[PDB]
């Protein structure tokens, strides 16, 4: 659904290049430290090791481009958030049929303490019904929850 554009990815690749001054495809403490020193920053050796260690998700001792991609993407390292998302589905999917129907949505809206017509629910479901299968799937629900 949400993917980085080519322009953003190109900038990301350029950013890796910014840290990877030697262009060997590998960024190490010496290169990272040099980049920070070039920026006028003066980090300690322990801090430099900590910077790599903290973002070294694969623990291969180095920061690869994928690691940098998520690193500069400011992605949360809390993977337990998936459980929270799953719990939201469980709450909405009261009947546990794996799908959210208009009736199930109506109950959620009803619990808000407001009275709405079935047509309004149907229209809301219809708008969020990207596939038009008359039901709201996980992907469709995610779009609804990521709606801003």
């Amino acid at each position: 659904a949400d993917q980085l554009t080519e322009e953003q990815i190109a900038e990301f690749k350029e950013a890796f290049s910014l840290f990877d001054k030697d262009g060997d495809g590998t960024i190490t403490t010496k290169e990272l430290g040099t980049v920070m020193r070039s920026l006028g920053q003066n980090p300690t050796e322990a801090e430099l090791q900590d910077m790599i260690n903290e973002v070294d998700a694969d623990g291969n001792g180095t920061i690869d481009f994928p690691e940098f991609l998520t690193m500069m993407a400011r992605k949360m390292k809390d993977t337990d958030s998936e459980e929270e998302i799953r719990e939201a589905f469980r709450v909405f999917d009261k009947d546990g049929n794996g799908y959210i129907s208009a009736a199930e949505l109506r109950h959620v809206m009803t619990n808000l303490g407001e009275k709405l017509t079935d047509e309004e629910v149907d229209e809301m479901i219809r708008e969020a019904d990207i596939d038009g299968d008359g039901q709201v799937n996980y992907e469709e629900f995610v779009q609804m929850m990521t709606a801003k």
């Binding site: 929270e84 939201a88 309004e120 229209e123 809301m124 708008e127 609804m144």
Partner: protein, 36 residues
């Protein structure tokens, strides 16, 4: 076990689209009159 804050965010998202949906729905009130 969703937190209240998380639930509130969910409600705000739904509330936000509900208001937009309601506005569009109320727009069709013009065509709810078939009397002539």
């Amino acid at each position: 076990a969703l937190s209240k804050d998380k639930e509130e965010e969910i409600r705000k998202i739904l509330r936000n689209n509900l208001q937009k949906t309601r506005q569009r729905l109320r727009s069709y009130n013009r065509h709810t009159l078939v009397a002539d």
